[model samples]
Target chain A: IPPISCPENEKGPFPKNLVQIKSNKDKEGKVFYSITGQGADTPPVGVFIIERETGWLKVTEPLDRERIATYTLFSHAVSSNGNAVEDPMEILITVTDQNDNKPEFTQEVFKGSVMEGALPGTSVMEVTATDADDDVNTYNAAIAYTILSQDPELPDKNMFTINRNTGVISVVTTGLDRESFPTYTLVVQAADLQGEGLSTTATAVITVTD
Target chain B: IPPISCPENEKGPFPKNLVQIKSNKDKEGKVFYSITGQGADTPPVGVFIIERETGWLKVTEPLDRERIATYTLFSHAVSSNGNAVEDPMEILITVTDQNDNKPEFTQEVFKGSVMEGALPGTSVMEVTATDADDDVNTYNAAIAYTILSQDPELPDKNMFTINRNTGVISVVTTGLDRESFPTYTLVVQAADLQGEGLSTTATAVITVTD
Candidate 1:
């Protein structure tokens, strides 16, 4: 028996049959199969199961690459009389990633302060969000930030601007005065799947001080 | 406001204060501070907290690099008159790795089959283990495998040998007779921190068939 390898990238509405195991000397004895491993009986249990008589291995549900990427299992076969017929074999299952998870901000509310009467184009604050699907370099996990709305409109409708690629927010208008408009609330959004897949929003509160 | 950075590699008896945030004009009026972010009030809640009046940021517990490596937060300061005193600032905390986690096997028992009279240098099975301490390239997470014991040392005490780095098990001696010994159970161990920091063990059962 040798280790069996399964590709990590499987999409499912699963109960998908992955591989089959059969003994070379099946004529000598009627054999039954069983599997045990990380996802078989451990903390993340029941990801894989085997048909006792058919030697069929199946994935029971959808898998997330961000949560667990691979599974290593041991397969064993026993005769109808409960006697061992074949040795155990190792099976490896790799879970591939999909654009499943949305971009999420580390904080629900971002707060920053800007001096009253500060010059335009001053860097006010930066907001960051992370995606669990893949790295920033990959389309599945790459995130882009945008200002969805702004309260008070301030001196202008575009008082603040955000870097779509980096999520850094900066001041774009100069007419900030604590007495006239002390606080401003902005709604920001982050999206993954190359800014088209899934998205999430967070609040950014900026205050001007004299 | 500038970003505040904290290292992740702090051993704790924690609830340790990491940094102090002060408003430049706190003396002119009463100022209150608050923080919001991923570790502050999000999924990993309470990992970070700030004193409302003091503007002090503190880490509540020891951080695991494997679970979460960094945190980003938004900081705010408000005056007694309910006026915004400072712009929101972004805070970034980076968690560093320590040799805290042990290597774990995907399976408790590994099973393999070998033919009787197999030649030396034949690979029988390979055992794999994963460490959560650091990435594979780092010494903190690098793993080494070794065979601890063998049940039937039939032909020789060194009938089976393992690849120290790959965890591959192979036959070292040629004399294997299924009639004399049908099975060999080996205890294998995997160690991380370059084989010095932490270790875990698994069972490997090899059966010889004609």
Candidate 2:
């Protein structure tokens, strides 16, 4: 017995065929099949259905790996004469993950600090983002960080740099004057799939103090 | 037995288990398991293998639905004496689709004509792009078009506009003097997943005529 695998976003029109089950004792069209369990009888119910005249399992809606990844179902086939064709079989259904979710920043605003007259290559702070897609090491979840915009351009917009792989921000320019600009507001961006995929934005504020 | 479902991009260092099977007749460790057929002996050979001690199916690498959508293989169980305890069973595997491919333009360069002094909203040309992600009508393949850059900003850079849903390019201003500007180079972009996913760019050369 093997569990059935289905796509998480495969909802084409609704009620698609997943897998067909045949009873060893089902002789011709004298058996009626019905499905019950998590998807068929619970809160997220009515998703799984079986045709009394058919043996295939159908899903009523599209699936989501982030919400419900695995499902347990049971199918019973009964003869028209009120006799059991075969005992109900446990059907395990697992939904496959896709790169459908964008990486989101854990915090809406990140605050960091840098002393006045800081030298170049000084570590400022690190931003973080998380992707809901499966597999932490796969390309779908790999995130890339970048600085999109910087307010208060008087001190130079290129004063800071960020590691693309890591979210660590560092100073790229030598001049860091507190009187010229007390603080820097950076509109940072975090994109999943190594910045080649979907993206989200977060704000970072770096304070300059003596 | 139901068909086993696995992710197309689930290559986590290879040799991952898919589903397990057991012999109804074999009491204990007397049965030996092995897998054969399409993936085991074909061009994509050795992709599938079964444990001799257990009854689970293992995959070598990630699968691609675009290249091979469905696979059929056979699994066998034999006793220590090579006596067949249970006959071989056919296993069916299907690969699921994901948003991996970027939208590609049908033509490298799109050429269109606009009459001299053309009125606003005049149809110029249409650009087409295709995506091989999955469903034709789904968001995975849904494309949105936009003008990335216009070579000639003279006579106003806001001279042309494109339909976001359709690739039809049209005039946004009444300035279509051929003497002023004979040709305009427009860089067009096509993005899949409703312009929120992967993107690709193309070139559009719109001719201004008298």
Candidate 3:
């Protein structure tokens, strides 16, 4: 259907005022709008204020799109006789998502040296991932890091502790017997959803330089 | 002015069927609506489904208040006898806001300690603060952390780093002498929108052990 026109008896002054909104283009994610509705007899005027004649909208201050979820606005029309000309209708403007986000590393890869033999419960390293989705989504995007492989014996052999939160890999136990296994091979995996899924996974190898 | 009604001649099997809307609600910040209007014949049966017989208008899906600002809908009415009916009028729907948010820390605080007599350029602790406001007003909510006191040193005198985006405070150098300044105390503050201009503030305290 074609757009309807304002009724004749229901005309005048048009939108008496306009609301001031922040620029929706900013990177911080902010959304806001002003209210403008008054009669032509007493038209509202100002820079940050909305223009009554053109019905154009603008922001009173800078806009940060990231911080704001969205905003809703209302506008009403008034007649020269000073009667409420009924509102044009409410308008809700929601800002769309942008790619201002960046990937984060929960922790830089950590390095530790073990002799040759280490006991289990011996912390080795911790691996963690980071994302910029916001709140729970950010944590949910985190992946676990692992040591890929070792030589004779598995480097990890479950002998290290890797913190899921801090992404720190440390020697859980002490003393590496260098004799039995001259070198060790360790395999690590980075998984998401607490290691349930793997969106992007990487591997790290640890060497027993003892 | 009262709402306009359809003409009698346009009654019964209205050439233009009755305009009906399903519902009005936002989904994930999106606004959407379904409508059915009278047809030349057949009365365009069940053009659209709605919750109320009159007054209330529904939408096909929940609207996303964040993604869409507002939406306009038209409902046409027709007569069973088949006659041209009045055109559909526009109904504007808007979405409102809810707090549904909490103060977030841009950067979680991490405290670091250095040995007494540590050389300059030695790093210490870092802190960050965050909030969820859509406009510059949100920046009003900022965060700050200070060293309340460290044994022999005066409060706010020691070294600290404040992150503008993350509200993180870190140590620039390490001259901390646990013996002289045995214990280090830190005070952290969080505010929104460039400080306390339009937002609130939160504080935290930290202790450094030798």
Candidate 4:
């Protein structure tokens, strides 16, 4: 269906600046069509870009749902003098969602405690979580834990490590002063594929007793 | 040279602690050495870093000698066991005269007046400068000119352009009232090497006579 009412203005067998979709869903991969008129190669000098010949209005990249809610683009008609024709309206492009994402933590908090006088390299506590994304994405859900902050005297400043694959936390330093900070609050983060930005996070707190 | 008979019980290759060059008269290339064995790469794990084995030092980067009067750094010697091998020492770095930089103006000050009434794009006074460095270094210099402050009546703010390459100031716009202020004070800063830290600054005042 073409937006403009002029039939002579429409150049193609289909129409100008329109995407013809056979199906609304991509569960099994669907086909679509794109139409354009004059100046197909070089549209207006502004932020206008044409989708080759297919004219399929599909997102070439994953949109950042957080920063930008959506974007609207307009295609203009050109006269023989290289000037824009009158009454150029906007074309609204709608983005569809795919289940390629999973629920993950924003900040993983692992809370645990050890004897106030524990030596360095001692196992004080462990914390971890999971992601619903598939394969590497799912396995990457394993988290590494570190003491976000601890009382100066807390042994090793609550220094700990997580297994790259297992997300198990281990104490790597000595000299954590329970008297300085009897309890430690830690913020753990988990992600897929080497803890990239696409990952999720969760948090927890641990207490060390006398 | 090295320290004379290091601290008691100190071993070979004793830590220089910190040796500071008090003045440029005792230095070359604006750099100095320290006995602190610490280095950028092998910095103390939990402490600060020393410049390393070559104790010989120079200002690795440009120095803003005008803004900073002096800077000090501490060097230390630790036993192979990571214990403080001896007391920490200090090293002072200073910049001497190489004429590598020339003084410049902090801002652009314009001095011009219309004949009580003038057309747009009228001619104005020009700005220029000289540097002490060699021709190549001096030629590459960039002079920054700005109207640090001006009278409220100078309606056209975009009235001047200083040839970045030639340091020549020219009138770019019109509309100036001589009745407001017959004289103008401009702060022109001519700097060397693209207006980098290794630059000197100067100031100039201009008067527009009817």
Candidate 5:
């Protein structure tokens, strides 16, 4: 059996056929293939399948490079007489990421309170989001967070700034007054692929308490 | 500001106080504590909170080693006048595994087919499981597989055996006939803590077909 390889982040209208195997010597005997190993017919199953009569191998769904980048399985061919025709062969499949998942916040809403007149650069709160794409040294999963909008633009249009890499939201300007603006709402956005791929948003509500 | 450390795998009647901070020079001024970082006010918010006056820091809920094993945060103390009294401090919290989660199979029911007269020692199929406990080179997350029972024990009492570490199920006997038994149901179990800890079971149905 020849090895089957799929790129790490292959998209699908899946059940895409990859390769076909046939027994040259056992033309009289019906041939069937069995797959077993890490991802097929085992834990995390349904990633791969084979046609019994045609020996056509296929991937059943989309592949994620982050969760499982590669798979190795044992493929065996048997005859209709219940006899093995050839030694068990090895098949490998590689999953490549393609910025498929957007960054998702663990929580729907983030809440924090800051002093009524806190100083500039005072850290108010932090909001975090996770990208399901590959997080290796690659940029596929590198996440950057931005303050898309701020409600009740207190004092000025820029009251808060976020750490692009860490997702920490901090106060960039002072002069926060609980009496004037009791609370502030920030719409935060997280984007993967160096902030160019998929994006997601969450709300951070900060209360200026006396 | 000093770094605070918490043990991993702490069970909660939560809102558990893990540490405290005090401003030495702010004795005359009313002090308030604020936390901002990975776990306190970040993506996984509300895990830790600080007393506005007492500077007591506590964890608000149970911690999971698998989801978030460690957290880092910055702590600050501000005076009633909204002036910073101390420099920002770093806080570290580590989550330890308590063997709280059982091993789980990727599939509820595994399906595979083997030739009726396959040779002894042939690989029939494999069942894999994952432990939600921390996988930090400890037995707390180590998983071992076993065949607890087999339905229609044909030929011999033990027709199949599973690899303790790999979870690969293989044929131990040779006399399999599709006429006698069309299918065999196996109850497979996976246990954490090197087989002494929490366990989970799944079913594997192997068809003996030509």
Candidate 6:
């Protein structure tokens, strides 16, 4: 059978029902069911339990995917005559992802350089951001880059452009004037959820050299 | 007895002696010693052991302060005839810190505002960083802030200053001009070991509003 799945960091009051099962020899009402394993009655116990009479399986606490990804549990049942109903049934629990962490840059600075007489479309540098979510294939962990603001709108306010998905920074105009400013600071932002979710910023310092 | 102290992330040839002892009845020759309880022979077993013939206590593995900070162990001694020499002597092991993790900023951006005609000592904003070492009092975790470079060097090349210990960003010159630039970027750096050790950078964006 497919595993039961739950989202991470879920707030709960108490034991929440995951799934309920029945046996052929004895009806669900007549069977005395119990759970045991890592999440049931072993170490880190009490996380999963089954109703003795109802056969309803439940989770006792919230789950975190970053810590423990999955749990394997077993369900056992017997009839009123103390006879075994069937062999143990395996139950697998999967923890789903949550967009809890913001994008973080590798370091504080992204250093790039260009000549004083550089032309438009000159490649400056690239910036990358890392996320802590489960899968980058999901939009919740994907990133988009953009220039939030630029320092010194001197020769031109809009002088640089960034590829949203590629994070490649390039000059959009030939306003590279070393006399006006030796360095240009770009406050670049990285947003998860494909540029719609939580965001973080970093510095891309472009140096205009001889 | 004083607790035995050890450093984190140690590289060792296993079974290195931490401390040795001798009981009054053992005459430093006739006694046999052993260790038990957590870390010695209990859960997380074999991390520590005692030489039965020499009463020398030793550690068998490297210690990680971030995982388990301290351990309590007991030593037992017996005479050549298997007679009890002394009661269990307590040994406390303290895991010291190592500068493994770099400083990380709380968020990516530090937003601040300044007037076009602001004074030289005008307070802009503050940037704080956290380290994963054992103590802020220690040099490994101690952080010092500095402005690595200004984005535009607008009216003056040196327009900002950061308090080395406080991380407060303030104007060093009355060079704020909304006409020339609406925003300024400061690549502020936080360094461990009083700005002498490892370092990382963050962005401090200051806007000059009307």
Cα lDDT tens digits for candidate 4, B71-107: 4445554433445544556544332222233444434
lDDT of 6 by residue, A1-210 (tens): 445666565555667777776687674537888887897899788988898988888888877777888899988988887877889999888776655567888868899988877788877889999988755224456789999988878688988999998999988887688887888899999977678666789999998898
**TM-score between candidate 6 and the true structure:** 0.48
lDDT tens readout by residue for model 3, B12-67: 23224223343232222232333443221124334224433342333323222334
Residues A6-43 of candidate 5: C-alpha lDDT, one tens digit per residue: 54433346788867755674567677788888788887
- The C-alpha interface RMSD of every prediction is 18.8, 3.2, 21.4, 33.0, 20.9, 21.7
Q: Between candidates 3 and 4, which one is better according to lDDT?
A: 4
The 0-to-1 C-alpha lDDT of every candidate, in the order given, reads 0.78, 0.83, 0.39, 0.40, 0.76, 0.78
Window of ten residues with lowest summed lDDT in model 5 chain B = B1-10
User: Which candidate would rank higher by DockQ, 2 or 5?
Assistant: 2
- Evaluated with TM-score, which candidate comes out highest? 2
- What's the candidate order when arranged by decreasing TM-score? 2, 6, 1, 5, 3, 4
Question: Per-prediction DockQ, in order?
Answer: 0.01, 0.37, 0.01, 0.01, 0.01, 0.01
- Residue A180's lDDT within candidate 5 is 90
Top model number, lDDT: 2
In terms of TM-score, which candidate is stronger, 4 or 5?
5
- Looking at candidate 5, what is the lDDT of residue A171? 81
| Candidate order (lDDT) | 2, 6, 1, 5, 4, 3
Candidate 4 global TM-score: 0.26
TM-score of every model versus the real structure: 0.47, 0.86, 0.31, 0.26, 0.45, 0.48
**Cα lDDT tens digits for candidate 1, B114-198:** 9877888999999999988656314556789999999888867778999999999999888788888888999999986456545
lDDT of 6 by residue, B175-205 (tens): 5788889989889888765675556888999
- Tens digit of per-residue lDDT, candidate 2, span B30-69: 8898877889877689888888887877888888877887
What does chain B score (TM) in every candidate? 0.86, 0.90, 0.40, 0.38, 0.83, 0.81
